[PDB]
Amino acid sequence: QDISLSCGASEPAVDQDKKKWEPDTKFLKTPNTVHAPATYQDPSLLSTVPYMTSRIFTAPATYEIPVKGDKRHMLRLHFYPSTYTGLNILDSYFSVAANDLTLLSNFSAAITCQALTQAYLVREYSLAPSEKDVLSIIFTPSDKHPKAFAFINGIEVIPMPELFDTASLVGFSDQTSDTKTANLQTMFRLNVGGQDIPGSQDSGGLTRTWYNDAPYIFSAGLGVTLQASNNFRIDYQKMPVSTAPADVYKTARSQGPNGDINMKSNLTWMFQVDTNFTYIMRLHFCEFQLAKINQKVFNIFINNRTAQGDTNPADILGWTGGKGIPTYKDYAIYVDANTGGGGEEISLQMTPSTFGQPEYYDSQLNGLEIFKIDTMKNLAGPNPKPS
Ligand SMILES: *[C@@H]1O[C@H](CO)[C@@H](O[C@@H]2O[C@H](CO)[C@@H](O[C@@H]3O[C@H](CO)[C@@H](O)[C@H](O)[C@@H]3O)[C@H](O)[C@H]2NC(C)=O)[C@H](O)[C@H]1NC(C)=O
Ligand SMILES: *[C@@H]1O[C@H](CO)[C@@H](O[C@@H]2O[C@H](CO)[C@@H](O[C@@H]3O[C@H](CO)[C@@H](O)[C@H](O)[C@@H]3O)[C@H](O)[C@H]2NC(C)=O)[C@H](O)[C@H]1NC(C)=O
Ligand SMILES: *[C@@H]1O[C@H](CO)[C@@H](O[C@@H]2O[C@H](CO)[C@@H](O)[C@H](O)[C@H]2NC(C)=O)[C@H](O)[C@H]1NC(C)=O
Ligand SMILES: *[C@@H]1O[C@H](CO)[C@@H](O)[C@H](O)[C@H]1NC(C)=O
């Protein structure tokens, strides 16, 4: 039921993670557009599919992809800002909309990749039920820059469950925000304390990629990673397995076995984001080391504000009721020039709590996902600044 389009391809093809891509032709409603091969194969590419073929728009173009109107959909846009003969990739500035929602605006894939030190870029969105049978994806080149063109290498539309419900509003009394109908952009998706998980090993058929979190640690210490044995079973109970694959829950980052120092420090991650949006932080948890409630009890801070702490700190077993049972909690934080970081940073910090006299002083995180919530029918932010 997935639609994985390699834009500008001639024939179907399979990538290095055994995903099958089909030509975008049948879904492109705009005639006479140009396709172009990239003339350089960056060593960082894990496959030529779909990155080595592109479609290049010098006028607006529209894709029409059939979707079931009441189901949520993941949308992925794949960009390889390489060399295409006769074009300067630095002249590419454009917008992308999904129905009436602006995804990208004045978007420079080249500048964005230069800032991340990446050769290609994948933008991933989760679109709420649309009530339409067609998802219209519109590429519009900037009319502000002449020579401006738009380009695309791959488009995926992937049906997905309603994995979003409510988020706890950070810095507020029991205040809860509804996210069931939100349109999201994925900012980060981390398998905390474990290996990269390729899309082929994701749960729910969702082919999400989960990255090791170490590149985002900003505390002086990296903590201690924990990994359950190969055969150890995660008992989802009634939690949808599409939430996250077992290997997210079978691995974790903790502060470690030395409790006195753990009280001396936070485990700290930091992330660059766009200002003037609310973000959902989904923290994934599973205790597979300790056995009872009130043994691992810790505070969680988000942008220096208490997310779980004071008289209600995080206790994974307190939440789940058993080893090997997974759970997660959603927290919502609004990021403006108030926060950062110059308004462009999310920090996540964990440290032991002494509340209730826990047996140990430690903290733990198994997974992390960060989503931008759409406001004013817009998810687009500025291009990053390379230095
Ligand atoms: C479309 O997006 C591009 C983003 O690449 C915008 O151009 C960029 O604008 C920024 C800020 O206006 C420029 O950076 C600034 O330079 C000065 C002087 O060094 C510095 O003091 C500032 O702190 C900042 O670094 C940046 O050079 C410029 N990039 C390019 C390639 O021109 C553009 O304005 C956007 N257009 C619209 C209509 O939104
Ligand atoms: C994040 O949100 C703030 C708050 O809305 C944005 O700042 C606002 O930006 C607008 C337009 O840039 C400002 O209004 C304009 O004022 C100029 C004179 O400076 C004039 O040409 C117009 O009358 C126009 O209304 C507004 O004053 C300003 N407000 C505040 C509180 O800063 C900010 O741009 C947003 N940041 C991003 C990255 O989107
Ligand atoms: C762990 O993380 C938080 C970071 O927000 C720290 O608690 C903040 O500490 C600073 C100064 O250290 C204060 O200005 C803030 O008001 C504190 N926030 C809250 C909600 O109390 C904490 O100091 C860090 N370190 C340790 C050892 O806990
Ligand atoms: C949190 O505290 C640090 C202290 O160094 C500060 O720089 C930052 O702006 C604060 N706010 C955040 C991270 O939102």
Curated annotation (Swiss-Prot):
Tissues where this protein is expressed: Expressed in pollen, but not in pistils or seedlings.
Glycan-bearing residues: N106, N266, N276, N304
Localization, UniProt: Cell membrane
Extracellular topological domain residue ranges: 1-387
Result of knocking out the encoding gene: No effect on male fertility and pollen germination, but siliques slightly shorter. Anx1 and anx2 double mutants show defects in male gametophytes due to premature pollen tube rupture.
Protein family according to the UniProt entry: Belongs to the protein kinase superfamily. Ser/Thr protein kinase family.
Function noted in UniProt: Receptor-like protein kinase that controls pollen tube behavior by directing rupture at proper timing to release the sperm cell.
More about this protein: Male paralog of FERONIA, a female factor expressed in synergid cells that controls pollen tube behavior.
Official protein name in the record: Receptor-like protein kinase ANXUR2
Organism annotation: Arabidopsis thaliana
Portion of the full-length sequence here: 28 to 414 of 858
